[PDB]
Short mmCIF file of C-alpha atoms in Angstrom, two decimals:
data_model
loop_
_atom_site.label_atom_id
_atom_site.label_comp_id
_atom_site.label_asym_id
_atom_site.label_seq_id
_atom_site.Cartn_x
_atom_site.Cartn_y
_atom_site.Cartn_z
CA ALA F 1 187.63 -4.81 65.49
CA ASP F 2 186.05 -1.96 63.34
CA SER F 3 187.40 1.23 61.97
CA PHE F 4 185.82 4.28 63.88
CA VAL F 5 186.48 7.87 64.54
CA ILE F 6 184.51 10.34 66.60
CA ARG F 7 184.70 13.68 68.50
CA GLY F 8 187.36 14.10 71.34
CA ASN F 9 184.58 15.25 73.54
CA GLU F 10 182.90 11.84 72.84
CA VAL F 11 186.06 9.74 72.64
CA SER F 12 185.76 9.33 76.44
CA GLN F 13 182.06 8.38 75.90
CA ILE F 14 182.98 4.88 74.56
CA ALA F 15 181.33 3.13 77.55
CA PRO F 16 177.88 1.50 76.59
CA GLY F 17 175.99 3.82 79.05
CA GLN F 18 176.16 7.09 77.13
CA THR F 19 172.86 6.61 75.31
CA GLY F 20 172.11 9.31 72.72
CA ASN F 21 173.50 10.39 69.41
CA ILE F 22 176.58 8.20 69.81
CA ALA F 23 174.47 5.23 70.84
CA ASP F 24 170.82 5.43 69.60
CA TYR F 25 171.92 6.75 66.08
CA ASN F 26 175.53 5.85 65.53
CA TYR F 27 176.29 2.58 67.36
CA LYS F 28 175.06 0.81 70.52
CA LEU F 29 177.06 -1.63 72.54
CA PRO F 30 175.16 -4.35 74.40
CA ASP F 31 175.28 -4.65 78.14
CA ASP F 32 176.37 -8.32 78.06
CA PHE F 33 179.47 -7.54 75.89
CA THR F 34 183.24 -8.37 76.17
CA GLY F 35 185.83 -6.40 74.29
CA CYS F 36 188.41 -3.70 74.43
CA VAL F 37 188.80 -0.10 73.19
CA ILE F 38 191.96 1.36 71.93
CA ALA F 39 192.82 4.75 70.36
CA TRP F 40 195.60 7.16 69.48
CA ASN F 41 196.02 10.64 68.10
CA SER F 42 194.41 11.46 64.70
CA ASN F 43 193.73 15.16 64.93
CA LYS F 44 196.95 16.55 63.17
CA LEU F 45 197.07 13.74 60.55
CA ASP F 46 193.58 14.34 59.30
CA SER F 47 191.98 17.88 59.77
CA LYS F 48 190.56 20.74 57.75
CA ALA V 1 174.25 32.67 88.11
CA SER V 2 177.27 33.51 90.24
CA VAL V 3 177.98 30.74 92.74
CA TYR V 4 177.60 32.35 96.23
CA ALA V 5 173.78 32.52 96.68
CA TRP V 6 172.63 29.85 94.29
CA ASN V 7 168.95 29.77 93.59
CA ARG V 8 166.51 26.76 93.15
CA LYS V 9 164.38 26.90 89.99
CA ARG V 10 161.54 24.73 91.11
CA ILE V 11 159.81 23.34 88.00
CA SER V 12 156.05 23.70 88.59
CA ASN V 13 153.23 21.40 87.63
CA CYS V 14 153.73 20.95 83.93
CA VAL V 15 155.22 18.29 81.38
CA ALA V 16 159.02 18.26 80.88
CA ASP V 17 159.40 16.45 77.46
CA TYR V 18 163.04 15.55 78.24
CA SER V 19 163.55 14.56 74.58
CA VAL V 20 162.93 18.25 73.65
CA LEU V 21 165.94 19.21 75.82
CA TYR V 22 167.94 16.48 74.23
CA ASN V 23 167.02 17.79 70.74
CA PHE V 24 168.58 21.16 71.39
CA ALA V 25 172.34 20.63 71.76
CA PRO V 26 174.71 17.79 72.67
CA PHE V 27 175.48 17.38 76.43
CA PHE V 28 178.90 17.21 77.95
CA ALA V 29 178.63 15.54 81.39
CA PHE V 30 175.17 13.90 81.27
CA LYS V 31 176.35 11.89 84.31
CA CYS V 32 173.36 10.92 86.51
CA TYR V 33 174.05 8.70 89.60
CA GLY V 34 170.30 8.18 90.00
CA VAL V 35 167.30 7.44 87.79
CA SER V 36 168.44 6.25 84.31
CA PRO V 37 168.87 9.41 82.10
CA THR V 38 167.52 7.35 79.10
CA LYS V 39 163.98 6.32 79.98
CA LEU V 40 163.01 9.58 81.62
CA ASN V 41 159.57 9.50 79.91
CA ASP V 42 157.36 6.94 81.34
CA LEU V 43 158.02 7.65 85.08
CA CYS V 44 156.49 10.55 86.92
CA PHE V 45 158.41 13.13 88.98
CA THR V 46 156.85 14.76 91.95
CA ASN V 47 159.10 17.91 91.79
CA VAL V 48 162.35 18.91 90.10
CA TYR V 49 164.85 21.54 91.56
#
């Protein structure tokens, strides 16, 4: 597991099919991959 | 547009550097249940509507 945080518009884009800024420039997940994705609220705890 | 008499902007004979459109602003849906919306460069489209 790796620490990660990204936009709430792109929090639903965690699937390895959304190829773009999130994938080609930030992090790409291989097609033959096994793993889980979990998340919780972090907007009020850290915001400016 | 207002959605009651929707038009069809037919893209004529030209070149649609799709990466230029992807360089403008982030996209929200980007969901394409067809051709892969990643390698939209090296295949040729007859007409776009």
